[PDB]
Design a protein around this ligand. Structure first.
Ligand SMILES: OC[C@H]1O[C@@H](O)[C@H](O)[C@@H](O)[C@@H]1O
Ligand SMILES: [Ca+2]
Length: 305
């Protein structure tokens, strides 16, 4: 009488989704009646699509899906609809229209813009406290920005809102470079290294990354160039990134709460598999089929708290 739930993780080597993957498996360990069928989609939506077909053929009673491509939500929903199986999307947010296209589709994640606002406020605080960072003394932050996947709601919101928030607080900004490194450490290292090796590299004052993995790559490129005096900011508060906040290699980050996103995803998926209301017997507040888990800013001043 075990209940099977199919789960896809877009890429197991994504630093953040690795934390989430492990947390959801710990949640499942505590539900002796449930079996998770865990899949690594290897950063390929076509691989994920085939994995979902296999999961459905195996009779799973719910799906928890971390999309490779957000725009593929519709495709995945139509697969789930064919079996009348509920689907809890997590971490890559489908459009409102996509969510509303199937009454058994839900989403667990975050308020993406909040992470951009928090990161921007963190940078504003550190900038005001470290006016030595204004290398050219023009009152503006000359920044470079390492973006996540184009079209990913967290990448778009974190990129828009970090700058909006700095500007709203009265801090002018000059974008010297902006490119995607696709959430990846090695790509970010190579991009940052190029920026440090190009003309007017001397003008760069602050590095902004949409996640910690990319921030960490930037930290390594700065080290290679003896330019570690330039501050770097990320998002996620990965343990490895918190170690760099401690050492001073990373100026700040933002907790993306993997534990509670994993728990909400599991709790809702299990309820839906059982034919119950998604939040039954839980304290999750579902707002129009969506659970959002707060972000929290982190730097040396609150690292212990
Ligand atoms: O979808 C995967 C991405 O999700 C974001 O919420 C995290 O901040 C990133 O680290 C991760 O690469
Ligand atoms: Ca400046």
């Amino acid at each position: 009488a075990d209940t099977r739930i199919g789960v896809t993780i877009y890429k197991y080597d994504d630093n953040f989704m690795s934390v989430v993957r492990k947390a959801i498996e710990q949640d499942a360990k505590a539900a002796p009646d449930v079996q998770l069928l865990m899949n690594d989609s290897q950063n390929d939506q076509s691989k994920q699509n085939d994995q979902i077909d296999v999961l459905l053929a195996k009779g799973v009673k719910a799906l928890a899906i971390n999309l490779v491509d957000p725009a593929a939500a519709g495709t995945v929903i139509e697969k789930a609809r064919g079996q009348n199986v509920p689907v809890v999307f997590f971490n890559k947010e489908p459009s409102r229209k996509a969510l509303d296209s199937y009454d058994k589709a839900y989403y667990v994640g975050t308020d993406s813009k909040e992470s951009g606002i928090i990161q921007g406020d963190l940078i504003a605080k550190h900038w005001a406290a470290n006016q030595g960072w204004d290398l050219n003394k023009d009152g503006q932050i000359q920044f470079v920005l390492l973006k996540g996947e184009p079209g990913h709601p967290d990448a778009e919101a974190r990129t828009t809102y970090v700058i909006k928030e700095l500007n709203d607080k009265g801090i002018k900004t000059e974008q010297l470079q902006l490119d995607t490194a696709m959430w990846d450490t090695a790509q970010a290292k190579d991009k940052m290294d190029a920026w440090l090796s190009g003309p007017n590299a001397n003008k760069i004052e602050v590095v902004i990354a949409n996640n910690d993995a990319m921030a960490m790559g930037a930290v390594e490129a700065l080290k290679a160039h003896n330019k570690s005096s330039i501050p770097v900011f990320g998002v996620d508060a990965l343990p490895e990134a918190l170690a760099l906040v401690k050492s001073g290699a990373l100026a700040g980050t933002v907790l993306n709460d993997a534990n509670n996103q994993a728990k909400a995803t599991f709790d809702l998926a299990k309820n839906l598999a059982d034919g119950k209301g998604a939040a039954d017997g839980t304290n999750w507040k579902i707002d129009n089929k969506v659970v959002r888990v707060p972000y929290v800013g982190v730097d040396k001043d609150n690292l212990a708290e």
